Write a protein that binds this ligand. Structure first.
Ligand code: MG
Ligand code: MG
Ligand code: MG
Ligand code: MG
Ligand code: MG
Ligand code: MG
Ligand code: MG
Ligand code: MG
Ligand code: MG
Ligand code: MG
Ligand code: MG
Ligand code: MG
Ligand code: MG
Ligand code: MG
Ligand code: MG
Ligand code: MG
Ligand code: MG
Ligand code: MG
Ligand code: MG
Ligand code: MG
Ligand code: MG
Ligand code: MG
Ligand code: MG
Ligand code: MG
Ligand code: MG
Ligand code: MG
Ligand code: MG
Ligand code: MG
Ligand code: MG
Ligand code: MG
Ligand code: MG
Ligand code: MG
Ligand code: MG
Ligand code: MG
Ligand code: MG
Ligand code: MG
Ligand code: MG
Ligand code: MG
Ligand code: MG
Ligand code: MG
Ligand code: MG
Ligand code: MG
Ligand code: MG
Ligand code: MG
Ligand code: MG
Ligand code: MG
Ligand code: MG
Ligand code: MG
Ligand code: MG
Ligand code: MG
Ligand code: MG
Ligand code: MG
Ligand code: MG
Ligand code: MG
Ligand code: MG
Ligand code: MG
Ligand code: MG
Ligand code: MG
Ligand code: MG
Ligand code: MG
Ligand code: MG
Ligand code: MG
Ligand code: MG
Ligand code: MG
Ligand code: MG
Ligand code: MG
Ligand code: MG
Ligand code: MG
Ligand code: MG
Ligand code: MG
Ligand code: MG
Ligand code: MG
Ligand code: MG
Ligand code: MG
Ligand code: MG
Ligand code: MG
Ligand code: MG
Ligand code: MG
Ligand code: MG
Ligand code: MG
Ligand code: MG
Ligand code: MG
Ligand code: MG
Ligand code: MG
Ligand code: MG
Ligand code: MG
Ligand code: MG
Ligand code: MG
Ligand code: MG
Ligand code: MG
Ligand code: MG
Ligand code: MG
Ligand code: MG
Ligand code: MG
Ligand code: MG
Ligand code: MG
Ligand code: MG
Ligand code: MG
Ligand code: MG
Ligand code: MG
Ligand code: MG
Ligand code: MG
Ligand code: MG
Ligand code: MG
Ligand code: MG
Ligand code: MG
Ligand code: MG
Ligand code: MG
Ligand code: MG
Ligand code: MG
Ligand code: MG
Ligand code: MG
Ligand code: MG
Ligand code: MG
Ligand code: MG
Ligand code: MG
Ligand code: MG
Ligand code: MG
Ligand code: MG
Ligand code: MG
Ligand code: MG
Ligand code: MG
Ligand code: MG
Ligand code: MG
Ligand code: MG
Ligand code: MG
Ligand code: MG
Ligand code: MG
Ligand code: MG
Ligand code: MG
Ligand code: MG
Ligand code: MG
Ligand code: MG
Ligand code: MG
Ligand code: MG
Ligand code: MG
Ligand code: MG
Ligand code: MG
Ligand code: MG
Ligand code: MG
Ligand code: MG
Ligand code: MG
Ligand code: MG
Ligand code: MG
Ligand code: MG
Ligand code: MG
Ligand code: MG
Ligand code: MG
Ligand code: MG
Ligand code: MG
Ligand code: MG
Ligand code: MG
Ligand code: MG
Ligand code: MG
Ligand code: MG
Ligand code: MG
Ligand code: MG
Ligand code: MG
Ligand code: MG
Ligand code: MG
Ligand code: MG
Ligand code: MG
Ligand code: MG
Ligand code: MG
Ligand code: MG
Ligand code: MG
Ligand code: MG
Ligand code: MG
Ligand code: MG
Ligand code: MG
Ligand code: MG
Ligand code: MG
Ligand code: MG
Ligand code: MG
Ligand code: MG
Ligand code: MG
Ligand code: MG
Ligand code: MG
Ligand code: MG
Ligand code: MG
Ligand code: MG
Ligand code: MG
Ligand code: MG
Ligand code: MG
Ligand code: MG
Ligand code: MG
Ligand code: MG
Ligand code: MG
Ligand code: MG
Ligand code: MG
Ligand code: MG
Ligand code: MG
Ligand code: MG
Ligand code: MG
Ligand code: MG
Ligand code: MG
Ligand code: MG
Ligand code: MG
Ligand code: MG
Ligand code: MG
Ligand code: MG
Ligand code: MG
Ligand code: MG
Ligand code: MG
Ligand code: MG
Ligand code: MG
Ligand code: MG
Ligand code: MG
Ligand code: MG
Ligand code: MG
Ligand code: MG
Ligand code: MG
Ligand code: MG
Ligand code: MG
Ligand code: MG
Ligand code: MG
Ligand code: MG
Ligand code: MG
Ligand code: MG
Ligand code: MG
Ligand code: MG
Ligand code: MG
Ligand code: MG
Ligand code: MG
Lengths: 64, 115, 143, 200
RNA sequence: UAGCGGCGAGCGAACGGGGAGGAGCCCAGAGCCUGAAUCAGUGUGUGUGUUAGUGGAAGCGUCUGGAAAGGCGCGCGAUACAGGGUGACAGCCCCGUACACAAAAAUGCACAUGCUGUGAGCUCGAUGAGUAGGGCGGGACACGUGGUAUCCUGUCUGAAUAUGGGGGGACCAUCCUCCAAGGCUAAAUACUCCUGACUGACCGAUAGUGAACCAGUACCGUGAGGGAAAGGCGAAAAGAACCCCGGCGAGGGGAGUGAAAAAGAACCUGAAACCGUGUACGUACAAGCAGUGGGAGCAUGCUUAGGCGUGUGACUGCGUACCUUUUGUAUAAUGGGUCAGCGACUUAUAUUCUGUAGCAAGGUUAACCGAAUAGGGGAGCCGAAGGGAAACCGAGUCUUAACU
């Protein structure tokens, strides 16, 4: 049988041109008033997955 | 393709039991016991090629030390005497000469006495 | 050449690791899987993305986006694969017969991927600004 | 390009079909694949599940000074198990069209260098009789052969069925293993023309 | 993939495309005209098949051996060199095989067709109510009530019934599309207790069925139920007449048979553990993983007028088994009485990477159609372009009012 994607992972990652993965940052859902604007600004744009935790991502979504 | 292994195993066991020929009891008869004996034999054989070279040197040195003291010189002084006269003859032969040709040997002790 | 004299290229075949066949084999007794623990066990090892009970990366990070239904039914036509249809007419049904875009694709777009020679009148199709310069530099008029 | 033995006519055959470098690896792969395709792979042992017998523990877990058993059917026991029992399987392996054609083009061109390929005009027995076919191969000086023909004569076919070392394939049904196996290959001028077009 | 999902584990479509196979009808009924085309009789009567079968080609001589099919040398049939037997391996000794032929009979079939029997055509229309839908509770849909369409209903209710009604994924309105609340339908499809034929990079008696053998037997269990072990003399029984020891036994020795009887029925081969008999050496003042380096003697084999092999090993230096598991094991931690046999990283499909071969901005087919590993079939897939949540733009694009 075909490998199943871990769908939850497929809904949090997206494959870029080179091979890396982009993802949204944590800490931007609730409890925002106490957080400085500078944090909330830096957490807004998407971010690349680190080389340490790339192998964990590559395995759990083997199609794209 | 099933593979019966009676022909090959026998040839493996029979090979080791051939090396264990001569050993006491199970050590010659019983593969499971012999195989240990044959490895241990290998281990001791390997170590004893090292110890043979030691033992014989002690043996020769004793012979030389014996044959020197008959002529009135100790081993320690004799060998320094020979080294100082640039004599290159080894223990193996000094020990051979000591036993066989003492009339010759005496000349080496005199040669050593010069130094 | 005879049926016996044939042989493969060097490096083609590579035997295969055979676990649990004595010391000399290298791997043998614990076939390269160490002493004890979950990973040594038959059927062992954890599932994918399991970090020892710490919240996994694919769960600590937030979910985002939505899948567009329109994006599934739109193609990116290569400008190199443009003059491979019917002289110089590339509507949609004509382009579909050339096996360049899928059957269920209504909208489509010609991008600048390089190289045109013949004049091609691109009808009923969205075209890029760089490709508009190329297609017209080759000869053909869009729409 | 290829001379005949009763005419000396210049049959102009294509260069990149009958005059190539012998790629051994490709040919080896195609012939191995062809062999693997011949397997029917019909076999089965029976796993500890498929063996007849009860799931009952022969004796209990502890208390008796014996090795913990869970089943009579376990593969360490006699008369039950086989751990990784074979299932009937298909050993046929894919070969790329271009690799198969490339291998044929490779082997069929090496027959020209080795001179196994004996190209001829009309090759056909008079009546469906082996005696005649066997007698006419004496003059041709052949024994172990692959007689490839475009127009497959029933008379010639029937007359080579009992002859072991002779085989009569159609120009359409040439094979990698066959062309290599037989010591000479006799192709009809029509068959060369069909094979030329087939391999291309 | 879209979705579903303590949005976890997992579950997972459809639309659309390529193929296999193709086929439709009847009811909820009134004119003229009429039994007609359809299912099915029953037939018979051809064609087939199935259950008995018939023919079926062409080798001899020497050599070795117990025996010839073998070797050696010359023949001959082959639409028959599949395969099997025969005193060792047979195209030609035999049974078969290719092929050519068969049925008194009872059946599987394949259409002429006399027909108890059954309505073709044709038009007027009718056109399936406790139903659709709804509330409540469950279930099925990939879809866990969710914003949930659709389907099913236990329960309580209730239209319009072609000026009508259903669906198009909350819902509404326009368009499109179908016509529920009644039935019946071959093929492609799944399976093999069973009957044949044929095939294995299947097994070869601890394997292969549990069962090669009088096996679902013996035996076990109150019972349901569980469940063994156990193959081979030889080409041919020619299976040892007759003597001798013994209890007119067992068992043996002869004699005989055979090529062979340590092939004599406890019967091919006959390993190992294990138990013996005889020869050589050592061994009754000597301490321990029993060996190992050294080494005398003695006994044999050889070449000899040196010694070198072989067996033994007095005396002597060193030397606490193997496996496991451990920081660490002679350990007084684990496992093993020994031998023989069997006993553990496999298989299928997906996926990424390495090597290797093909072809290259292309590569490549799937099912299937092919009797066919050829070759068609590119439906697809993957690649050559990405950015963005997405519309969208695209060698750029996103961010942002705009970006050094
Ligand atoms: Mg928010
Ligand atoms: Mg802070
Ligand atoms: Mg802060
Ligand atoms: Mg920060
Ligand atoms: Mg992909
Ligand atoms: Mg994909
Ligand atoms: Mg195999
Ligand atoms: Mg075998
Ligand atoms: Mg043995
Ligand atoms: Mg062994
Ligand atoms: Mg022995
Ligand atoms: Mg010995
Ligand atoms: Mg000895
Ligand atoms: Mg033994
Ligand atoms: Mg012995
Ligand atoms: Mg012995
Ligand atoms: Mg030294
Ligand atoms: Mg190799
Ligand atoms: Mg190598
Ligand atoms: Mg390598
Ligand atoms: Mg393998
Ligand atoms: Mg290794
Ligand atoms: Mg190692
Ligand atoms: Mg490893
Ligand atoms: Mg372990
Ligand atoms: Mg541990
Ligand atoms: Mg570990
Ligand atoms: Mg397990
Ligand atoms: Mg597990
Ligand atoms: Mg926790
Ligand atoms: Mg969310
Ligand atoms: Mg979200
Ligand atoms: Mg397509
Ligand atoms: Mg099971
Ligand atoms: Mg059970
Ligand atoms: Mg139970
Ligand atoms: Mg115990
Ligand atoms: Mg025991
Ligand atoms: Mg059994
Ligand atoms: Mg079994
Ligand atoms: Mg097994
Ligand atoms: Mg196994
Ligand atoms: Mg395979
Ligand atoms: Mg494989
Ligand atoms: Mg193909
Ligand atoms: Mg041959
Ligand atoms: Mg939804
Ligand atoms: Mg929840
Ligand atoms: Mg939670
Ligand atoms: Mg389910
Ligand atoms: Mg399911
Ligand atoms: Mg499942
Ligand atoms: Mg579908
Ligand atoms: Mg469909
Ligand atoms: Mg269509
Ligand atoms: Mg068709
Ligand atoms: Mg019909
Ligand atoms: Mg009707
Ligand atoms: Mg009617
Ligand atoms: Mg009848
Ligand atoms: Mg009849
Ligand atoms: Mg017939
Ligand atoms: Mg018959
Ligand atoms: Mg007959
Ligand atoms: Mg005959
Ligand atoms: Mg004779
Ligand atoms: Mg004779
Ligand atoms: Mg012979
Ligand atoms: Mg010979
Ligand atoms: Mg002969
Ligand atoms: Mg001859
Ligand atoms: Mg001759
Ligand atoms: Mg002959
Ligand atoms: Mg044959
Ligand atoms: Mg046949
Ligand atoms: Mg035949
Ligand atoms: Mg036979
Ligand atoms: Mg014989
Ligand atoms: Mg025989
Ligand atoms: Mg002959
Ligand atoms: Mg012959
Ligand atoms: Mg004869
Ligand atoms: Mg037949
Ligand atoms: Mg015929
Ligand atoms: Mg008949
Ligand atoms: Mg009759
Ligand atoms: Mg009749
Ligand atoms: Mg009848
Ligand atoms: Mg029937
Ligand atoms: Mg109706
Ligand atoms: Mg209706
Ligand atoms: Mg009613
Ligand atoms: Mg509704
Ligand atoms: Mg309802
Ligand atoms: Mg409802
Ligand atoms: Mg509702
Ligand atoms: Mg209510
Ligand atoms: Mg409610
Ligand atoms: Mg509800
Ligand atoms: Mg829920
Ligand atoms: Mg459900
Ligand atoms: Mg529900
Ligand atoms: Mg609601
Ligand atoms: Mg939801
Ligand atoms: Mg939910
Ligand atoms: Mg609706
Ligand atoms: Mg619907
Ligand atoms: Mg009405
Ligand atoms: Mg009304
Ligand atoms: Mg409606
Ligand atoms: Mg409805
Ligand atoms: Mg509606
Ligand atoms: Mg709607
Ligand atoms: Mg729908
Ligand atoms: Mg309108
Ligand atoms: Mg309509
Ligand atoms: Mg109608
Ligand atoms: Mg209904
Ligand atoms: Mg119905
Ligand atoms: Mg029916
Ligand atoms: Mg029909
Ligand atoms: Mg069948
Ligand atoms: Mg069967
Ligand atoms: Mg086999
Ligand atoms: Mg058995
Ligand atoms: Mg046996
Ligand atoms: Mg047995
Ligand atoms: Mg059983
Ligand atoms: Mg009983
Ligand atoms: Mg019995
Ligand atoms: Mg027996
Ligand atoms: Mg007798
Ligand atoms: Mg008596
Ligand atoms: Mg008595
Ligand atoms: Mg008597
Ligand atoms: Mg008596
Ligand atoms: Mg008696
Ligand atoms: Mg008697
Ligand atoms: Mg008697
Ligand atoms: Mg008797
Ligand atoms: Mg007797
Ligand atoms: Mg006797
Ligand atoms: Mg006798
Ligand atoms: Mg006799
Ligand atoms: Mg005789
Ligand atoms: Mg004789
Ligand atoms: Mg014999
Ligand atoms: Mg004999
Ligand atoms: Mg004899
Ligand atoms: Mg005799
Ligand atoms: Mg005898
Ligand atoms: Mg006797
Ligand atoms: Mg005798
Ligand atoms: Mg014998
Ligand atoms: Mg006897
Ligand atoms: Mg004998
Ligand atoms: Mg014998
Ligand atoms: Mg017996
Ligand atoms: Mg016996
Ligand atoms: Mg016996
Ligand atoms: Mg036998
Ligand atoms: Mg025999
Ligand atoms: Mg015997
Ligand atoms: Mg013996
Ligand atoms: Mg023995
Ligand atoms: Mg013994
Ligand atoms: Mg004994
Ligand atoms: Mg003595
Ligand atoms: Mg003695
Ligand atoms: Mg003594
Ligand atoms: Mg004393
Ligand atoms: Mg003593
Ligand atoms: Mg003691
Ligand atoms: Mg001690
Ligand atoms: Mg010793
Ligand atoms: Mg020694
Ligand atoms: Mg020694
Ligand atoms: Mg000595
Ligand atoms: Mg002596
Ligand atoms: Mg010794
Ligand atoms: Mg003494
Ligand atoms: Mg000592
Ligand atoms: Mg010690
Ligand atoms: Mg120690
Ligand atoms: Mg252990
Ligand atoms: Mg432990
Ligand atoms: Mg400890
Ligand atoms: Mg220690
Ligand atoms: Mg211990
Ligand atoms: Mg102790
Ligand atoms: Mg312990
Ligand atoms: Mg303990
Ligand atoms: Mg342990
Ligand atoms: Mg322990
Ligand atoms: Mg123990
Ligand atoms: Mg295995
Ligand atoms: Mg593995
Ligand atoms: Mg494999
Ligand atoms: Mg597939
Ligand atoms: Mg794959
Ligand atoms: Mg790669
Ligand atoms: Mg690579
Ligand atoms: Mg390469
Ligand atoms: Mg390459
Ligand atoms: Mg190339
Ligand atoms: Mg290239
Ligand atoms: Mg190239
Ligand atoms: Mg390019
Ligand atoms: Mg292409
Ligand atoms: Mg291709
Ligand atoms: Mg067909
Ligand atoms: Mg077909
Ligand atoms: Mg055809
Ligand atoms: Mg055909
Ligand atoms: Mg064909
Ligand atoms: Mg096409
Ligand atoms: Mg193509
Ligand atoms: Mg893109
Ligand atoms: Mg993107
Ligand atoms: Mg825009
Ligand atoms: Mg924008
Ligand atoms: Mg901008
Ligand atoms: Mg700007
Ligand atoms: Mg700017």
């Amino acid at each position: 049988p075909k490998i199943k994607t871990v769908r939850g992972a497929a809904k949090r990652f997206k494959k870029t041109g080179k091979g890396g993965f982009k993802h949204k940052h944590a800490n931007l859902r609730h409890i925002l008033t106490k957080k400085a604007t500078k944090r909330k600004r830096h957490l807004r744009p998407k971010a690349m997955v680190s080389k340490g935790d790339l192998g964990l991502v590559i395995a759990c979504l083997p199609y794209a | 393709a099933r593979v019966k292994r009676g022909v090959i195993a026998r040839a493996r066991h029979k090979k080791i039991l051939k090396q264990a020929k001569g050993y006491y009891g199970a050590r010659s008869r019983v593969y499971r016991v012999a195989f240990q004996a044959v490895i241990k034999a290998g281990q001791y054989a390997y170590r004893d090629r090292r110890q043979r070279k030691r033992q014989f040197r002690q043996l020769w040195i004793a012979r030389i030390n014996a044959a020197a003291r008959q002529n009135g010189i100790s081993y320690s002084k004799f060998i320094n005497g020979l080294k100082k006269a640039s004599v290159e003859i080894d223990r193996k032969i000094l020990a051979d000469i000591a036993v066989f040709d003492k009339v010759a040997f005496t000349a080496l002790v005199e040669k050593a006495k010069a130094a | 050449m005879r049926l016996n004299t044939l042989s493969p290229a060097e490096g083609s075949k590579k035997a295969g690791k055979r676990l649990g066949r004595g010391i000399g084999s290298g791997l043998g007794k614990t076939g390269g899987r160490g002493h004890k623990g979950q990973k040594s066990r038959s059927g062992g090892g954890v599932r994918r993305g399991f970090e020892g009970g710490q919240m996994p990366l694919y769960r600590r990070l937030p979910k985002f986006g939505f899948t567009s239904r329109k994006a599934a039914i739109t193609a990116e036509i290569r400008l190199s694969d443009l003059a491979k249809v019917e002289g110089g007419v590339v509507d949609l049904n004509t382009l579909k017969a050339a096996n360049i875009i899928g059957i269920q694709i209504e909208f489509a777009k010609v991008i600048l991927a390089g190289e045109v020679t013949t004049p091609v009148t691109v009808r009923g199709l969205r075209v890029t600004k760089g490709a508009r310069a190329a297609i017209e530099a080759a000869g053909g008029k869009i729409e | 390009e290829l001379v005949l033995k009763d005419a000396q006519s210049a049959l102009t055959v294509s260069e990149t079909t009958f005059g190539r470098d012998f790629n051994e690896a490709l040919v080896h792969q195609v012939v191995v694949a062809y062999a693997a395709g011949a397997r029917q792979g019909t076999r089965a042992q029976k796993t500890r599940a498929e063996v007849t017998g009860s799931g009952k523990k022969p004796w209990r877990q502890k208390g008796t000074g014996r090795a913990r058993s869970g089943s009579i059917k376990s593969p360490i026991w006699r008369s039950g198990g086989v751990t990784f029992a074979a299932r009937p399987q298909d050993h046929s392996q894919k070969v790329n069209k271009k690799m198969y054609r490339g291998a044929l083009k490779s082997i069929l061109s090496e027959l020209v260098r080795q001179d196994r390929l004996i190209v001829v005009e009309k090759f056909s027995v008079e009546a469906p009789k082996t005696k005649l076919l066997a007698q006419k191969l004496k003059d041709m000086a052949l024994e172990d052969v692959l007689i490839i023909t475009g127009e497959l004569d029933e008379n010639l076919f029937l007359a080579a069925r009992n002859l072991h070392k002779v085989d009569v394939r159609d120009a359409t049904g040439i094979d990698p293993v066959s062309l290599i196996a037989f010591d000479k290959v006799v192709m009809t001028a029509d068959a060369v023309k069909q094979v030329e077009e087939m391999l291309a």
